[PDB]
Amino acid sequence: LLKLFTTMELMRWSTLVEDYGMELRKGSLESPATDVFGSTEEGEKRWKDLKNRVVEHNIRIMAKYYTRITMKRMAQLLDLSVDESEAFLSNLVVNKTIFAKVDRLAGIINFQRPKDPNNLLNDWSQKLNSLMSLVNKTTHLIAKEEMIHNLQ
Amino acid sequence: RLEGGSGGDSEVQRTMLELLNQLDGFEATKNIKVIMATNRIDILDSALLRPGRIDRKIEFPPPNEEARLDILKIHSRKMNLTRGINLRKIAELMPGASGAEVKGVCTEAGMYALRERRVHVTQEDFEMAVAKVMQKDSEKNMSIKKLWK
Amino acid sequence: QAAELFLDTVSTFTSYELMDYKTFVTYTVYVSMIALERPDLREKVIKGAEILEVLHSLPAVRQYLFSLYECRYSVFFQSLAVVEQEMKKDWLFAPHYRYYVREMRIHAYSQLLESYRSLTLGYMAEAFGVGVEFIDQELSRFIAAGRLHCKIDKVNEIVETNRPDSKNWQYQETIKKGDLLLNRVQKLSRVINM
Amino acid sequence: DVLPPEADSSIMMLTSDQKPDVMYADIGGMDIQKQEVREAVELPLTHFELYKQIGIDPPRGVLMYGPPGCGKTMLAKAVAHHTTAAFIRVVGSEFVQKYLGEGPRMVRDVFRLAKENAPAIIFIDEIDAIATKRFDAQTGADREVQRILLELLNQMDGFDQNVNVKVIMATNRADTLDPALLRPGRLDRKIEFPLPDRRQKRLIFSTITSKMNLSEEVDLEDYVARPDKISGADINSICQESGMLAVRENRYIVLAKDFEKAYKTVIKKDEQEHEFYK
Amino acid sequence: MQSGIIHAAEEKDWKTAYSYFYEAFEGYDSIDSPKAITSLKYMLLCKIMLNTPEDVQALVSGKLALRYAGRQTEALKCVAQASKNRSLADFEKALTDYRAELRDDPIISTHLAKLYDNLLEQNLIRVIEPFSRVQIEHISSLIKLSKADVERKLSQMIL
Numbered sequence: 061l062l063k064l065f066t067t068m069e070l071m072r073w074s075t076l077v078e079d080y081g082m083e084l085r086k087g088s089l090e091s092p093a094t095d096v097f098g099s100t101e102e103g104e105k106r107w108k109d110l111k112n113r114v115v116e117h118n119i120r121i122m123a124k125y126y127t128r129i130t131m132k133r134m135a136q137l138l139d140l141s142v143d144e145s146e147a148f149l150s151n152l153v154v155n156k157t158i159f160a161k162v163d164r165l166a167g168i169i170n171f172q173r174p175k176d177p178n179n180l181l182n183d184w185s186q187k188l189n190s191l192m193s194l195v196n197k198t199t200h201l202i203a204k205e206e207m208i209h210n211l212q
Numbered sequence: 213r214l215e216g217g218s219g220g221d222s223e224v225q226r227t228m229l230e231l232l233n234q235l236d237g238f239e240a241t242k243n244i245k246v247i248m249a250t251n252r253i254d255i256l257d258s259a260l261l262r263p264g265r266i267d268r269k270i271e272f273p274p275p276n277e278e279a280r281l282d283i284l285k286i287h288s289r290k291m292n293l294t295r296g297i298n299l300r301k302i303a304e305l306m307p308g309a310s311g312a313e314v315k316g317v318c319t320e321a322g323m324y325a326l327r328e329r330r331v332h333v334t335q336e337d338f339e340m341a342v343a344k345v346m347q348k349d350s351e352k353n354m355s356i357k358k359l360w361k
Numbered sequence: 362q363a364a365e366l367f368l369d370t371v372s373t374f375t376s377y378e379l380m381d382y383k384t385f386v387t388y389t390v391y392v393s394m395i396a397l398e399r400p401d402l403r404e405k406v407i408k409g410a411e412i413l414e415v416l417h418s419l420p421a422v423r424q425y426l427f428s429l430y431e432c433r434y435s436v437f438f439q440s441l442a443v444v445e446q447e448m449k450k451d452w453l454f455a456p457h458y459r460y461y462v463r464e465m466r467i468h469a470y471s472q473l474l475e476s477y478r479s480l481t482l483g484y485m486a487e488a489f490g491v492g493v494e495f496i497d498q499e500l501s502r503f504i505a506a507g508r509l510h511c512k513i514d515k516v517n518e519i520v521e522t523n524r525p526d527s528k529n530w531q532y533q534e535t536i537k538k539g540d541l542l543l544n545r546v547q548k549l550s551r552v553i554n555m
Numbered sequence: 556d557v558l559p560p561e562a563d564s565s566i567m568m569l570t571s572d573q574k575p576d577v578m579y580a581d582i583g584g585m586d587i588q589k590q591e592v593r594e595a596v597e598l599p600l601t602h603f604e605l606y607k608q609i610g611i612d613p614p615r616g617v618l619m620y621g622p623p624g625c626g627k628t629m630l631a632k633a634v635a636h637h638t639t640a641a642f643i644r645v646v647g648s649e650f651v652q653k654y655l656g657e658g659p660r661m662v663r664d665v666f667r668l669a670k671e672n673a674p675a676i677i678f679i680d681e682i683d684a685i686a687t688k689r690f691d692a693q694t695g696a697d698r699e700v701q702r703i704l705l706e707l708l709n710q711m712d713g714f715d716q717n718v719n720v721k722v723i724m725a726t727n728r729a730d731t732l733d734p735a736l737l738r739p740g741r742l743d744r745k746i747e748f749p750l751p752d753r754r755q756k757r758l759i760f761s762t763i764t765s766k767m768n769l770s771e772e773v774d775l776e777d778y779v780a781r782p783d784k785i786s787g788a789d790i791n792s793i794c795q796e797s798g799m800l801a802v803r804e805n806r807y808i809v810l811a812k813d814f815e816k817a818y819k820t821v822i823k824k825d826e827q828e829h830e831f832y833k
Numbered sequence: 834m835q836s837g838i839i840h841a842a843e844e845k846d847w848k849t850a851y852s853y854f855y856e857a858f859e860g861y862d863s864i865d866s867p868k869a870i871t872s873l874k875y876m877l878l879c880k881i882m883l884n885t886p887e888d889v890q891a892l893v894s895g896k897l898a899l900r901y902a903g904r905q906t907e908a909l910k911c912v913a914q915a916s917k918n919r920s921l922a923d924f925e926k927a928l929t930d931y932r933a934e935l936r937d938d939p940i941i942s943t944h945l946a947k948l949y950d951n952l953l954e955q956n957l958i959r960v961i962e963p964f965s966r967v968q969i970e971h972i973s974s975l976i977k978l979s980k981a982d983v984e985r986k987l988s989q990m991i992l
C-alpha cells in the first residue's frame with residue numbers, strides 16, 4: 061500500500077507479480093490473500109482488476125511528468141500491446157478522467173494542453189510579480205539583519 | 213344604506229354621504245361635471261339617483277346590425293382581408309352581440325390565419341368564429357323546458 | 362432583391378396579374394441559389410412544401426437542386442448544361458446567361474474547397490467531371506479574378522487552400538473602413554477653415 | 556437619490572428556486588390545450604411581429620376550467636418553466652383579509668408591480684372565491700368580496716390598458732361566476748379540460764410508465780378501454796399504488812397482478828344505493 | 834391511419850401518431866386483413882424512431898399480433914435488433930437481406946433513411962475524441978465501413 065501511494069514508487073507490474081506472487085501462494089498465515097485472489101472466477105477477475113488498477117496508476121503519473129511520449133515507449137512501460145494501450149487510453153479519455161490527446165499517424169501523443177495568450181502572459185506576469193519583486197523585497201530585509209549581527 | 217353594524221357596513225356609508233353632500237350640499241358649486249358609469253341600476257341607492265344630482269341617465273343597448281357592421285369595419289381596418297368577402301352577413305349571424313366580442317371574432321379569425329403561418333382570410337373563417345363566440349347552455353332532458361311551456 | 366420577394370409563392374392562377382405559375386416557379390428557383398448559400402437555404406426552398414409540389418412536376422429542375430445540395434458535382438454540370446441552353450429561350454435573358462453560369466461555377470468550387478485544405482486536382486478528374494487541365498485553367502482564371510480563395514499548384518499537383526482567420530479577416534475590414542472615414546474627415550476638415 | 560420604482564411593494568418574483576420543477580413535454584396528451592395556452596402567453600412574447608403583420612392585438616387573458624385533477628396547475632407550472640417573463644403567483648384567497656379596504660389595495664399592489672416590470676405573467680389560482688356575481692348583499696363584508704371583483708375589473712379593463720401583462724385564471728365549475736369577467740377583451744380564452752378520453756388514457760399511460768420499470772408482457776390495454784371514467788391524477792395513483800405494491804413483496808418489478816389490486820383500490824367508490832331508486 | 838401519417842410526417846410527435854395507427858389497426862381487426870397487415874408496419878416504425886426497440890418484440894409477442902406473423906414482422910424485428918445494438922452495417926445487412934418488404938417506401942423507407950443517416954454520425958462523434966489527428970482508413974476500420982462514403986459523410990458535417 062505504501063508502493064501504491066504516488067510518484068510511481070518506481071514500479072512495474074512484471075516486478076509486482078514476481079515478488080508478491082509468493083504472497084498469493086502458501087505462507088505462514090496468508091489466508092485473506094488466498095481468499096481474495098487465486099479463486100476460479102472471482103479471484104481471477106480480481107487478478108485482472110489489480111492489473112487494471114496499476115496501469116491506471118501509471119497513466120496519471122505520466123500526465124504529471126511528461127510533455128509528450130511516443131507510443132512505443134508507453135506500450136513497453138505498461139507491459140501490454142500497442143493496440144491495447146490505444147483502447148485503454150481511448151476509454152479513459154471518452155470517460156474524460158485523464159486529460160490527454162493522441163496523434164496515431166506518427167505515434168507521438170501529448171499530455172500538455174494548448175495554452176492561451178491570455179494564459180501564457182498571465183504566467184509571465186505571475187513569475188514576474190510574485191517571486192521577483194517579493195523575494196527581492198525579502199532578501200533586502202535579511203540583508204539588513206546581517207548588519208545587526210556582524211558589525212559591531 | 214343598510215342599518216347599524218352587526219351585519220352593517222357603516223363606514224363607506226360615511227364616504228357615500230360625503231359624495232352626496234359635496235355635490236348637492238349647502239353650496240351649488242360650478243364648472244364641475246361628474247360622469248358615473250356602472251351596470252346594476254336597480255341596486256344603487258335612490259338618493260344619488262334623484263334628478264337634482266344626476267340629470268342625464270343614459271342607457272347602452274346592444275348594437276344593431278348596421279352598428280355591428282360598423283364596429284366590424286373599425287377593427288378589421290388594420291387586418292388584412294382577402295377579397296370577395298361580405299361583412300354584412302357576418303353581423304347577420306349575431307343576434308344580440310355586445311361589441312366587445314366583435315373584437316373577439318376579429319382576433320380569432322386572425323388567430324386561425326396565424327397557425328397556418330398565413331395572412332389570408334375567408335368569409336367562412338368568420339362563419340366559424342361567430343359560432344365559436346356564441347355559446348349556449350344547451351339545456352338538457354327537455355323535461356324542464358316542457359314542464360314549462 | 363429578386364429572390365427576396367419572389368419567396369412568397371402563394372399566388373397561383375395564371376392570370377394577367379399572375380402571368381404564369383409554373384415558369385414563375387422556375388424563375389424563383391434559378392435566382393434563389395445566388396441570394397444565399399447556407400444561411401438556411403434549405404428551409405425556404407427545400408423544406409418548403411408548396412414549392413416542392415411543382416418541382417415534383419419538373420424532374421430536371423428538381424435534379425438541378427438536389428445535385429448541388431447533396432454535393433453530386435458531376436451530375437451538377439450536366440444539369441447546369443441543360444439550364445444555360447434552356448435559358449436561351451427567354452426575353453428577359455440578356456443579363457442572365459454569361460453572368461449566371463460563371464457565378465454558379467464559382468459557387469460550386471467555393472463550397473467544394475471547403476472541408477478540405479489539401480485537395481489534389483487529380484481528384485477533380487473523376488469525382489467532378491474530367492479534364493485535369495480544364496480544372497487547372499479554370500481555377501487559374503478564378504484565383505486571378507480575386508475570388509475563389511485558394512492556391513493552385515503545379516508539379517506537386519496539390520490544390521492547397523488559404524482562408525483567413527478571424528483576426529486576419531477583422532483586421533482587413535477595419536483598415537478598409539478606417540481609411541474611408543479618414544478620407545471622409547480629410548475633405549470635411551478642408552471645407553471648413555476656408 | 557431616487558429609488559427604483561416599486562422595488563418591494565409585495566415582493567413576488569419567482570426566480571430560480573423557486574421555479575418550476577417541471578418541463579413542457581412532461582404532460583401527456585393535452586395536444587389542443589397546450590397549443591392554445593401557448594398562443595396567448597408564450598408566442599406573443601417571442602414572435603410579436605406575427606401579430607403585427609396581421610394586426611391582431613393578441614389575446615390578453617385565459618380561463619381554464621374542468622373537473623379537479625386534470626392537469627390545470629401542472630400546465631401552469633410548465634408555462635413558468637419556459638417563459639422568460641416576470642412571473643407572479645397569486646392564490647385567490649390571500650387578498651381578502653382583516654381590515655377595511657385592505658383587500659383591494661393588494662390588488663393595486665399586484666398590477667402596479669406587473670406594469671412596472673417587464674412583459675409579465677400573473678397566475679391567480681382558483682378565483683371562484685372572489686368571482687360569484689352578487690345581486691345585493693344585505694350584510695357587511697359580503698360587499699367587501701363584491702368590491703374586490705370591481706377593483707379586479709377596473710385594473711383589467713380601465714382607462715390605462717396596461718400592456719404586456721398576462722392573466723391566467725383557473726377554477727372549478729365556472730357557470731357560477733360573474734358574466735362581467737367572461738366578456739372577451741378581458742378573458743378572451745375559454746378552455747375546458749375534459750377528464751381524459753380514450754386515446755389520451757394511452758398517452759398518460761405512456762408518460763407515467765415510461766419512467767418506470769414495467770418490463771412485462773401483460774399490457775394496460777385491458778385498462779385503456781374500461782368504462783367508468785378515471786381522472787388523470789388517478790392514473791398517477793394507479794402507478795403509485797403498484798409502485799408501493801411492487802416493493803411491498805420486495806420486487807424491483809411490477810408483476811401485473813398487483814396492477815389489478817391497484818386498479819380495484821382506486822375505483823371502488825359507490826357501494827350501497829339501497830337497491831332503491833334504481 | 835392517415836391521422837398517424839400526417840402526425841408522423843411532422844417528425845415531431847412519435848407518440849400520438851402511434852395512438853392513431855393503433856386505433857386504425859383495432860378498427861381493421863380481422864375485418865379487412867390486407868388493410869390491416871400494413872398497419873403494424875407503420876406503428877412499429879413509429880416505435881423505432883421513438884427509440885424503444887424492445888417493445889417492437891413485445892407487441893409481436895402479443896396475442897393479437899400472433900395472428901399476423903410472417904416476413905414483415907421478421908423485417909422489423911431484426912431492424913430493431915440492429916438499431917438496438919448500434920451496429921451500423923448490421924442495419925445495412927438487415928436492409929439488404931429483406932429488400933422488397935421495406936426498401937420500398939410506404940412510406941417507412943423515408944424515415945429509415947433518416948434514422949440511418951442519423952446513426953452514422955451518432956457513432957462517428959464517439960470516436961474522434963481520443964485523437965487530435967488520424968488517417969481515415971483507421972476510422973473506417975473502427976466503424977467497419979468503406980472510406981468513400983466516410984469521406985462524403987464527414988465533409989457534409991464540416992459544411
Ligand SMILES: Nc1ncnc2c1ncn2[C@@H]1O[C@H](COP(=O)(O)OP(=O)(O)OP(=O)(O)O)[C@@H](O)[C@H]1O
Pocket residue numbers: 581582583584585622623624625626627628629630759762787788789791
Ligand atoms: N396529462 C398528465 N400527465 C402527467 N400527469 C398528470 C396529467 N394530468 C394530471 N396529472 C397528475 O395529476 C396531478 C394534479 O395535477 P393538477 O394539480 O394540475 O390538476 P388540477 O386539475 O390542477 O387539480 P386542481 O384543479 O384540484 O388543482 C399532477 O400532480 C400530475 O402528476
Ligand SMILES: [Mg+2]
Pocket residue numbers: 627628
Ligand atoms: Mg391546482
